[PDB]
Amino acid sequence: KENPMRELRIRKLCLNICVGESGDRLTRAAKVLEQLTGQTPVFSKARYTVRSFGIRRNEKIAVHCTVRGAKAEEILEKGLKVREYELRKNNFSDTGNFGFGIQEHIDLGIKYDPSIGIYGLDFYVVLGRPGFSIADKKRRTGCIGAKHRISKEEAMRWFQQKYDGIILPG
Amino acid sequence: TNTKGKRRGTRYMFSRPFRKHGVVPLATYMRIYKKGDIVDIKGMGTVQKGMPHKCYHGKTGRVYNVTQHAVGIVVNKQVKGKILAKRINVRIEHIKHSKSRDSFLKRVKENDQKKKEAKEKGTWVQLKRQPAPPREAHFVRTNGKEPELLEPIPYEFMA
Amino acid sequence: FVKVVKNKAYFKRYQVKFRRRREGKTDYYARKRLVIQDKNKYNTPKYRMIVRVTNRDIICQIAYARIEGDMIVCAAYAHELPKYGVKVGLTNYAAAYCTGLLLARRLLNRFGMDKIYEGQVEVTGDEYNVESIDGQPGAFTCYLDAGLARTTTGNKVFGALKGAVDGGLSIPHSTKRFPGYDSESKEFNAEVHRKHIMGQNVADYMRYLMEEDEDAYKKQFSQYIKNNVTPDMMEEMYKKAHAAIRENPVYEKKPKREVKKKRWNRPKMSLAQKKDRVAQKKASFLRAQERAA
RNA sequence: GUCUACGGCCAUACCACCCUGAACGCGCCCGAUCUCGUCUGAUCUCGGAAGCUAAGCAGGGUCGGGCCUGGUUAGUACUUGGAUGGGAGACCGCCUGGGAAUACCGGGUGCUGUAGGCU
RNA sequence: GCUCAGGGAGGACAGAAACCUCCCGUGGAGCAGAAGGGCAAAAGCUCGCUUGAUCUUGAUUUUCAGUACGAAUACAGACCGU
């Protein structure tokens, strides 16, 4: 049968917000994550000056927050409640860790304030399995095993068996 | 004329060998050397401080002083003027070995052992290296087969 | 499509590193700077003390550099403590201190310096350097070798180091990476360090879990309840363990069991067997294709 | 026969696939209550064993690749010294010593010092 | 404490290009400059505080007539930094 040391589970949920604007929009996007999670998120800066987008070197644009624990499960439950248990083929990656972006945050359940504005985000679900400390530990790093790797078809059939969500083609 | 320089024309001399880049073994570092040992110099690319000059590659010398990092050696430089037994300071990495002195010491020890041996017998022992003589006459055996009469081959065009 | 990364030119020109470097255990850049030795010392054996941290055992070896290999002259382990009578507290600061003190007293008893440098019996935590007492010759000294571990404020490696210093191994160190030392206010607190030595912070939280809930307490200490040692017994247990260290520091080797002499390894396959395998495959494939088609 | 820790020589040791593993032994893992630094025990550190050899690790094959080593290439290319040697030049041979590198085809997939254990 | 050039799979605004992690990655990036050698738990990247770019005597090397000048080498003695 199946070993209980091979039970697939969710590791984390990446939640990035890139509005493409610095100043007021950035802090009003950070206040949404402050009201949702209740912790300080990690900002990010630009690469170089581009005249097309209108950004310069060393200027904060986007902000992310890797949510772990039961809070990531509750925010992913909000995301499934918004997306009514359906996904697409292009949202799944070939490795297995998969993301999908939303437009507005009023469908989650958060009350909309007129001064803040609409801020959506990407639910980048990172799944896992017991035994991924050798991949990032201090002593040794190496391969973890071909049967231990998680595949795209296995992740899709696990999602369909567990969460009962259909996967439409296209 | 020509350009003066310490590291000039040393693209292949002080460069690292094939598949010997980066990781340096720890054999030469932890071992020691006594005073007055036969040491010849081979260059190295990973060492930047205390390098030998490009005109001291493959020169045999002996150690006169032993410091912590850079030990001294009396190398026999043959400059255009004359031969000088000069003193330079080279770090541990540019130090090789030589089995000729070891074989010479083992040969002297074996000759002393054979000299102490058979003293009560009183027999003469060939100690010196007698050079290669011509061969001794011997009988060439043959049976059954005969030497084949070989003949040359005609010319054919190569290309 | 894209170009294949694993090319045959890359297989030919790919240089491999050392075996321990590929395994990722030996740090050569730090190890060389630890094993530096002056060339005017003329074969002076540099002794060093190596700490390794397993999940349960604490390995404390003593090595010295040789050209064939650094031979281990002595080694202390934590699983030999129930032989002396240490049932509970297998891997903590007190077990690391007792392992270091036992290794130090065994080392001085093997070199023959047991009566000189009796050591700190009543452990307090105050600093006491190892100074050379005249009359007797020079005492043993060595150097520290922590390994692949970040030395933060408070560690069992520094506890074994303090045990070796109290036993009589003069190793130079500072009082910064010790437990009880505050990071901001920066004062070494001997009374707080005595709490880390004796283990009041463990026993108070054991009493707190005993007041709170039994399930998490049993899950945290499953066989520690089975060994039946109260937290009031925890303070006197290490006091008896110190006397057990002072009684018999030397260790006697185990009698080995007779080997049944069987090869558990799979034997190496020869050229004739490999040729027979590929010949049976090439003979079976053609007749199977003829039988199927 | 075999494991762990400390190691030397550094691909016969390297990358992938497949199969099997009694005992010791190394690890997966549960949490943050303290020292510890981070959004978060994700990293380090600390407190431990509910479970497991699944993964990790050990061993062996791939008409596997790479690597090491012999034949082949081949007395072939080249090269020290010499000549009323030739040839209009270009270039080549002789006396004499030495002596290659590919492509291609055969064999193999680590030795190993000390300490601590299993049988 | 970590790893870069460059590339694969994607995501409402967002495309060839703003941001994120999943998979590798002998160096094809970077190490101040033209160039050469060399560099992967580093000599690249980021951090804590520092100034050994401190002082006093020699010997030796590179061109050299074994003559200067500049540069470099570990030694002799104290004193600082993490």
mmCIF file of C-alpha atoms (C1' of nucleotides) in Angstrom, chain B residues 5-8 10 13-14 41-45 47-59 73 75 88-95, chain E residues 61-62 72-73:
data_model
loop_
_atom_site.group_PDB
_atom_site.id
_atom_site.type_symbol
_atom_site.label_atom_id
_atom_site.label_comp_id
_atom_site.label_asym_id
_atom_site.label_seq_id
_atom_site.Cartn_x
_atom_site.Cartn_y
_atom_site.Cartn_z
ATOM 1 C CA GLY B 5 58.645 42.224 -16.938
ATOM 2 C CA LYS B 6 58.244 39.632 -14.198
ATOM 3 C CA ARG B 7 55.383 37.619 -15.749
ATOM 4 C CA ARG B 8 55.926 37.969 -19.505
ATOM 5 C CA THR B 10 54.136 32.892 -19.322
ATOM 6 C CA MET B 13 54.490 28.116 -18.077
ATOM 7 C CA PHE B 14 52.814 29.287 -14.865
ATOM 8 C CA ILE B 41 61.106 24.586 -8.667
ATOM 9 C CA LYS B 42 57.893 24.262 -10.679
ATOM 10 C CA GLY B 43 55.593 27.250 -11.116
ATOM 11 C CA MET B 44 51.998 27.593 -9.972
ATOM 12 C CA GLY B 45 49.173 29.900 -10.999
ATOM 13 C CA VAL B 47 49.999 31.556 -5.798
ATOM 14 C CA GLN B 48 50.247 35.339 -6.222
ATOM 15 C CA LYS B 49 52.284 36.505 -3.208
ATOM 16 C CA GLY B 50 55.910 35.399 -3.107
ATOM 17 C CA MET B 51 56.173 34.126 -6.677
ATOM 18 C CA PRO B 52 59.398 32.984 -8.332
ATOM 19 C CA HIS B 53 60.627 34.887 -11.361
ATOM 20 C CA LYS B 54 60.054 33.397 -14.818
ATOM 21 C CA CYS B 55 63.780 32.631 -15.256
ATOM 22 C CA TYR B 56 63.848 30.237 -12.268
ATOM 23 C CA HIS B 57 61.741 27.378 -13.660
ATOM 24 C CA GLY B 58 63.218 23.919 -13.167
ATOM 25 C CA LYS B 59 66.280 25.019 -11.171
ATOM 26 C CA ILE B 73 66.891 27.965 -1.162
ATOM 27 C CA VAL B 75 69.685 28.036 -6.460
ATOM 28 C CA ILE B 88 66.059 33.219 -2.857
ATOM 29 C CA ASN B 89 62.922 32.854 -0.724
ATOM 30 C CA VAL B 90 60.152 30.624 -2.109
ATOM 31 C CA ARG B 91 56.915 29.596 -0.400
ATOM 32 C CA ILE B 92 55.982 25.933 0.192
ATOM 33 C CA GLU B 93 53.816 25.485 -2.927
ATOM 34 C CA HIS B 94 56.682 25.635 -5.455
ATOM 35 C CA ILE B 95 58.468 22.600 -3.988
ATOM 36 C "C1'" U E 61 65.165 39.672 -6.220
ATOM 37 C "C1'" U E 62 63.614 41.824 -10.891
ATOM 38 C "C1'" A E 72 57.854 43.070 -4.472
ATOM 39 C "C1'" U E 73 59.534 38.910 -0.672
#
